Structure formats: structure tokens, C-alpha cells
Amino acid sequence: AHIFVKPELVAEIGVKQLQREIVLPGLVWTNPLTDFGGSKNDTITVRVPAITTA
Amino acid sequence: NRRDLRDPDRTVIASELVEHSFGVTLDKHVYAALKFTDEQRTLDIRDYTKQVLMPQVSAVAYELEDYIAELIEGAPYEETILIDPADTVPAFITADQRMGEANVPTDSRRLVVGSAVAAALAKDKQFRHADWSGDQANAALREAHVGRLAGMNVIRSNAIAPDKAYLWHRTAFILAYRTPVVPEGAKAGASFSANGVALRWLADYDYSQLGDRTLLDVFTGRKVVTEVDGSFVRAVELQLQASSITIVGGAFALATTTGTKQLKVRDDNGTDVTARCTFASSAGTKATVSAAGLVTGVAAGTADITASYVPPQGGTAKTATVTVTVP
Amino acid sequence: QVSAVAYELEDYIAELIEGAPYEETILIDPADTVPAFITADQRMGEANVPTDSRRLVVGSAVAAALAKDKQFRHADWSGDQANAALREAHVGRLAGMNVIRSNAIAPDK
Amino acid sequence: FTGRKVVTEVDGSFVRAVELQLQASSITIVGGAFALATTTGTKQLKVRDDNGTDV
């Protein structure tokens, strides 16, 4: 019958993909060692002191 | 992506950015028409607004409510959370957990319960015993009103099924409305409102039937917002469990062979489940029971009529037996 | 790009925490959950770990089971007549630690 | 650039962190019993334990 040329227009109503919150990086020990450049194999050898017995 | 330091394969895997989309369409046309003879309009109709227009507007409003209810109840839910009437709170905590696990935002969540679910909340010993819930000024006992549980407020509705509750984020369901325009050839009609929806009213006299025809209509459309993979996670469905069904009235005697009796079946929660049970008669010759609850006993004798209702939780259908003595 | 890198680093940390060589796993009984956390405290104290700077990160299912637990739902069994585990679905502190709910780790851990 | 480390004891034992897992006593398939529409019909199964964990 009657044929009309109409555009196909795109909208955006605020329906975004659901993603979780990020909480882990704040709870973990970050950067106690920084001088990996200037060490062999990018390795820092943390020393744990000694204990003895009587 | 990830890779190793000092790795002699200095390649990078490019990431991709794909946008998705869905579509919202107008689909339905909700109307309410009437027709009046000239005699009725002259004599019988005394107040047109009170007798004709207001009932028509109310009918369209209730039709729109039922439209929204069919949208909410008919949405694709992968699974239903079964509310144990003795222990109701774990079901709602589970619903909140399912919404959280899908990363649905915690605000703009509406929980709409049926009458049976609200009554089960009130009857629950968790809210009723004033030591399992604090709340010394007991409200589930002195008012039969729970109100809030598991972090969500309760909205009591009679449009949805009594034994079912829905917890949905605001973005789950979309309604769209459109008021039809009064054309050039039409008599200049009015425009009314039903629950904030603008309805078009129109009147046309037909010489052939010597009468007047009225129409009060609107264009409607609805959508369930699903995710990119096709799942539905923004709304959660709960259904009240049923463990046994009973036929009200017990054993009964028919008035006569030509007589009929309309059976009603109620689960232990008290919901009217007669629209969901299958009816059978042990003695088909003596009595026959319709699939919709009607019982007709053609021959004198006794018949054992069984109502079988598959419960919401599945499994073997609950069977209720009644005895009919046809005279 | 920034969001992808942030989520990837969170996954990195989650794999670090989850993949650690845990000697024994303490099985939380969803009907009675508190003894599992008290047992975790006992195990960590018996190893002479300092009582400060401890973090408890639970999954979704663990927090839901804490909320469902009758130890926290019933106000006679826990005080807390406001009943934040019933009106809300929030159990926030038990066995001397504060609960942090995360979706990165496994739900039942 | 990123790196990570689990701090173990001098004997190799890890005592500075403890994991807890939630017990499961029964698993149920979402959808329960079903009948396929055709042979070509494919159904994805989700299994949930009694705690509602997708296992």
C-alpha cells in the first residue's frame, strides 16, 4: 500500500553492560620492592632473619 | 592480555570493540468500544459521564494494568526461586544474591508480591515470634504486615498471581505509549487519561443501526531488556511452594443426575489452584468431571474424583481425592 | 582500554590469592557458619600470625549463607534486635573480622 | 609490568593465609526434567548446589 521512506534511528537510554566492582587491588600489599631494575633476573632476595634454640 | 617480560616474541594481540543493540517496537492497540441505540441514549442513559465514560476509562486502565502484569509475569526467567512457607527469608536472600551475582545495581529495585506470598510472610515464624525478629511491638502478629525483609520493601499487588513475587531493577521492563490522533474526517473527540496514559476518545453515529458507537483507545508496546548473550538477569522470580492440595467442601452428594457442581482446589498455602489441576473420575459411567472443575454425574452410584496438581517445585503431582454420591 | 587493564589486574590479584598453596580448607557448614570462622582464627593464631592487618574477603555465596544463618537471622540468638541480617541481608562482622564481599573470587570461598 | 609473590615460611609451609569453602550437600540441574523438542534441539545445562552456587 502506502510506502514511506523512514530513517532507522539509534537511541541510547542508559542500558549498559553489567560489570563488577573492583575491590581486590586495595587489600593486597603493593610495591614493597621497587628496584627490580638494577638486580639480576629482576629479582630482589628478601632476607628473613635467623632464630636459635637453647 | 598478558605476556612475559624479555619474551623474544614481541607480538601484541589487538583487542576488539563491538557495540551491541536491541529494539523497542509498538505492537498492541488497547481499546474499549461501546454502542448505544437512540432509544437507550434518549431514555435509559441519564448521566453520560457517570454511566459511560468513567467505566470505559476504568476498563482501559485495568486492561493496561493487566498488560503490564503480563509483561512482568511472562518475562523469560531461567529459574524460579521456591519460597518455603515455613522458611521464607532464605528465598529472598537468594534472590538478592542472584541479582548481585549478575552485577545488577542495588538501587531502583522493586519487589512486588502476591497476596499469598504476603500472607506467608506474615504467617512465618521468623517474623511472627518477636524473638526471631526482634520487633517487640509485633507487626506480623498484631497487624499481619511484614513490610521489609532481606533488604527490599514489599509492594502488595492483586494483578500478579497470589503465590508469586518479582524483584526487578528499573531497567528490566520498558513500556511505551502513543495516543492515536483524531483524523480529519472524525467528529472532534476528547482525550482522557488512564493512570497517566493519554487515551483517544471518538464517537461515530451509524445510520444503519440508528445508534452511536464510542471508542477509547491507545497504542502500547512493551519490552524485556535482556543482555548481550540473551540471558535475563535484571529481574528475578519467586514462587511459593505447595506441598498438598485439598478439594474444598469434602465429600459431597449431587442434587440429581442432571446436576452439576463446580469444584475448587486449594493448596496448603490457600491459593486457588483450580485453574492448574487435572480432574479425573474413577467411575466414568456414574460421574464425569470436566477439565475446568465442573462435575456431572449422569448415573446413580458413587465416583471417586481426583484432582492432580503438579507443584511449583516439580516432582510427583499432588493428588486430592473426593467421593461423589450421585442419586 | 583502561577498564580492561584494571579488570585484568584485578583478575591477576584474584589468581594470586586463590592459587596460593593452602594446606587445609576449612569447610563452612551453611547451617552453622560461625565455627568455621572461629576455626580460621584459631589456625591463624596457632601459627603466631599477628592479629592486626588481617583481611577477610568472602564470595557471594559465603555472604549469602552468613545472612541465611539462624545465628544471625534470629535476634534472640545474636542480640542485634534491629536484625540487620533479616531486614537487610547484611552480615558485616563475625569472629572478630570484618567481611569484604567480592565478585572476583569464587562464590563459595 | 607486573609481578606477584606468595610469602611462604622458611620450612615451605604457608600459614599467613587461610581459605574457607562452603559445604555442598546436593546438586540440582536448573530446569529439572525436560524433553527435547527435536534431535537438533540443544540445551545448555546449569548445575547448582544447595547453596545456589553454579558448580
* CA end-to-end span of chain B: 82
DSSP string, B72-140: HHTS--S-EEEEBTTB-HHHHHHHHHHHHHTT--SSSEEEEE-HHHHHHHHH-HHHHSSSSS--SS-HH
Grid coordinates representing B203 are 464517537
Rg from Cα positions in chain B: 28
Of the CA atoms within 13 Å of residue D54, those in its CB half-sphere come to 10
Interface test with C, best of B97, B109, B125, B149 (most C CBs within 10 A): B97
Q: Using CA of residue B143, residue B149, residue B154, residue B158, what is the dihedral sign?
A: negative
Classify each residue of C27-59 as buried b or exposed e, where b means 16 or more C-beta atoms within 10 Å of its C-beta: ebebeebbebbebbbeebeeeebeeeebebbbb
* CA end-to-end span of chain A: 103
Grid coordinates representing B74 are 511472562
Using alpha carbons only, what angle is made at residue C65 by residues C64 and C71, rounded to the nearest 5 degrees?
120
Q: Using the beta-carbon criterion (under 8 Å), do C104 and A23 form an inter-chain contact?
A: yes
Grid coordinates representing C13 are 590479584
Grid coordinates representing B220 are 502500547
φ, ψ for residue B90 (rounded to 5)? Answer: -55, -35
Q: Using the beta-carbon criterion (under 8 Å), do D32 and B314 form an inter-chain contact?
A: yes
Where do we find the cell 449422569? Answer: B298
Contacts of B132 in chain C (CB under 8 A): 73-76
Report the C-alpha gap between C67 and B90 in whole angstroms. Answer: 8
Of A13, A20, A42, the CB nearest to B103: A20
Report the C-alpha gap between B61 and B80 in whole angstroms. Answer: 29
**C-beta of residue B152 within 8 angstroms of C-beta of residue B93:** no
Q: Using CA of residue C82, residue C87, residue C91, residue C94, what is the dihedral sign?
A: positive
Grid coordinates representing B244 are 498438598
Spell out the residues 6+ positions from residue B236 whose beta carbon is closer than 8 angstroms to its own. Answer: B77, B81, B95, B98, B99, B166, B167, B168
**C-beta of residue B157 within 8 angstroms of C-beta of residue B114:** yes
Residues 17-36 of D with CB under 8 A from B: 30-33
Taking CA atoms, B34 is separated from B42, B44, C63, C70, in Å, by 16, 15, 58, 59
SS3 call for B301:
strand
Where do we find the cell 552468613? Answer: C66
Resolution (angstroms) equals: 3.6
SS3 call for C40:
helix
Q: Using the beta-carbon criterion (under 8 Å), do B21 and A42 form an inter-chain contact?
A: no
Contacts of B78 in chain D (CB under 8 A): 30-31, 46
Other residues' Cβ atoms within 10 Å of the Cβ of residue B97: 26
Please count the residues of chain B. 327
Rg from Cα positions in chain C: 16
Classify each residue of B263-295 as buried b or exposed e, where b means 16 or more C-beta atoms within 10 Å of its C-beta: bebbbebbbebbebbebebebeebbbbeeebeb
Is the CB of residue C84 less than 8 Å away from at least one CB of chain B?
no
Experimental method: cryo-EM
Of the CA atoms within 13 Å of residue D4, those in its CB half-sphere come to 16
Q: Is D7 left (phi over 0), alpha (psi -120 to 50) or beta?
A: beta
Q: Using the beta-carbon criterion (under 8 Å), do B314 and D30 form an inter-chain contact?
A: no
Q: Using the beta-carbon criterion (under 8 Å), do D3 and A42 form an inter-chain contact?
A: yes
Report the C-alpha gap between C75 and B295 in whole angstroms. Answer: 51
Taking CA atoms, A41 is separated from A26, A45, B5, D6, in Å, by 28, 11, 10, 18
Where do we find the cell 495516543? Answer: B179
Task: Give which of C78, C85, C30 is closest to B149, Cα–Cα.
Answer: C85
Interface test with A, best of D2, D5, D13 (most A CBs within 10 A): D5
CA distance C76 to chain B (A): 5
Report the C-alpha gap between C82 and B135 in whole angstroms. Answer: 8
Contacts of B221 in chain A (CB under 8 A): none
Taking CA atoms, A47 is separated from B57, C16, D9, D16, in Å, by 83, 22, 12, 17
Residue B153 is inside which H or E element, if any? strand B152-153
Report the C-alpha gap between B35 and B63 in whole angstroms. Answer: 19
Using alpha carbons only, what angle is made at residue B203 by residues B200 and B207, rounded to the nearest 5 degrees?
155
State the burial class of residue D16 (Cβ atoms within 10 Å of its Cβ: 0-12, 13-18, 19+): middle
Task: Give which of D48, D2, B229, B100 is closest to C67, Cα–Cα.
Answer: B100
Q: Using the beta-carbon criterion (under 8 Å), do D3 and A48 form an inter-chain contact?
A: no
Grid coordinates representing B49 are 459521564
Task: Give which of B223, B240, B235, B237 is closest to B109, Cα–Cα.
Answer: B235
Report the C-alpha gap between C57 and B14 in whole angstroms. Answer: 33
Report the C-alpha gap between B138 and B127 in whole angstroms. Answer: 8
Q: Using the beta-carbon criterion (under 8 Å), do D14 and C30 form an inter-chain contact?
A: no
SS3 call for C19:
coil
Other residues' Cβ atoms within 10 Å of the Cβ of residue D12: 7
- Bridge partners for B323 per DSSP: B304
